Paper text:
As part of the secreted C. perfringens CAZyme arsenal, the bacterium possesses an open reading frame coding for a 220-kDa family 31 glycoside hydrolase (locus tag CPF_1301 in strain ATCC 13124) with predicted α-glucosidase activity, which will be hereafter referred to as CpGH31. Though the putative CBMs, referred to as CBM32-1, CBM32-2, CBM32-3, themselves are not closely related at the amino acid sequence level, a primary structure comparison indicates that they all belong to CBM family 32, an observation that is supported by their overall similar structures as determined by X-ray crystallography. Each CpGH31 CBM32 structure comprised the β-sandwich topology characteristic of this CBM family with a short α-helix and a calcium ion capping one side of each module.
Multi-dimensional heteronuclear NMR experiments were used to map the GalNAc binding site on the apo-CBM32-1 structure, determined to 1.35 Å resolution, as co-crystallization and soaking attempts of CpGH31 CBM32-1 with galacto-configured sugars were unsuccessful. When mapped onto the apo-CBM32-1 structure, the four regions formed a contiguous site localized to variable loops located at the apex of the CBM, comprising an aromatic residue (Tyr972) and several polar residues (Gln971, Asp975, Ser973, His990, Gln992, Asp993, and Asn1022), consistent with previously identified CBM32 carbohydrate-bindings sites. However, the secondary aromatic residue (Tyr1774) and binding site histidine (His1671) of the CBM32-3:GalNAc complex described above are structurally conserved with corresponding residues in the binding site of CBM32-1 (Phe1085 and His990, respectively).
Author numbering: 954 to 1095
Write the structure that this text describes.
């Protein structure tokens, strides 16, 4: 299956509430239709995914809401082994050389130039429709 190398039983950490039933766990439930949707502005707030174990990750796929509140245009992504010290591994924030994402609901892929040993990912929304984060799926690949 195409997702054989996506870690199972990822856990999430979000401290600022959800909209309706769109809970943080729905960003990593393997269902492209279900989503996390923040209750309020997610700008500069960390959405953390704990893979439970360190893996050498080769790429990320992110899937956001299509054309509505929470569709992400720009974000920074950080990685950590210990959950304290994070290093930036991706940015399409203003000033970077990477274009903002279209709000088209299609998979956004980040292919790492070399695999990175990581346990935790932190996603920091920098620009999004309505300032929310609405993330249908986050998939790191071993
Ligand atoms: Ca989902
Ligand atoms: Mg690997």
């Amino acid at each position: 299956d195409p997702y054989r190398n996506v870690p199972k039983d990822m856990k999430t950490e979000w401290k600022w509430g959800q909209y309706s039933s769109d809970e943080p766990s729905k960003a990593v439930d393997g269902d492209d239709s279900s989503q996390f949707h923040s209750q309020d502005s997610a700008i500069d707030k960390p959405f953390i995914i704990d893979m439970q174990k360190a893996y050498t990750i080769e790429k990320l796929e992110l899937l956001f809401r299509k054309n509505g509140n929470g569709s992400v245009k720009r974000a920074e992504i950080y990685s950590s082994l210990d959950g304290v010290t994070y290093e930036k591994v991706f940015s399409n924030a203003e000033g970077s050389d990477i274009a903002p994402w279209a709000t088209d609901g299609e998979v956004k892929t980040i292919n790492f130039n070399k695999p990175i040993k990581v346990r935790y990912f932190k996603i920091v929304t920098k620009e999004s429709i309505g300032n929310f984060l609405a993330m249908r799926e986050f998939r790191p690949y071993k």
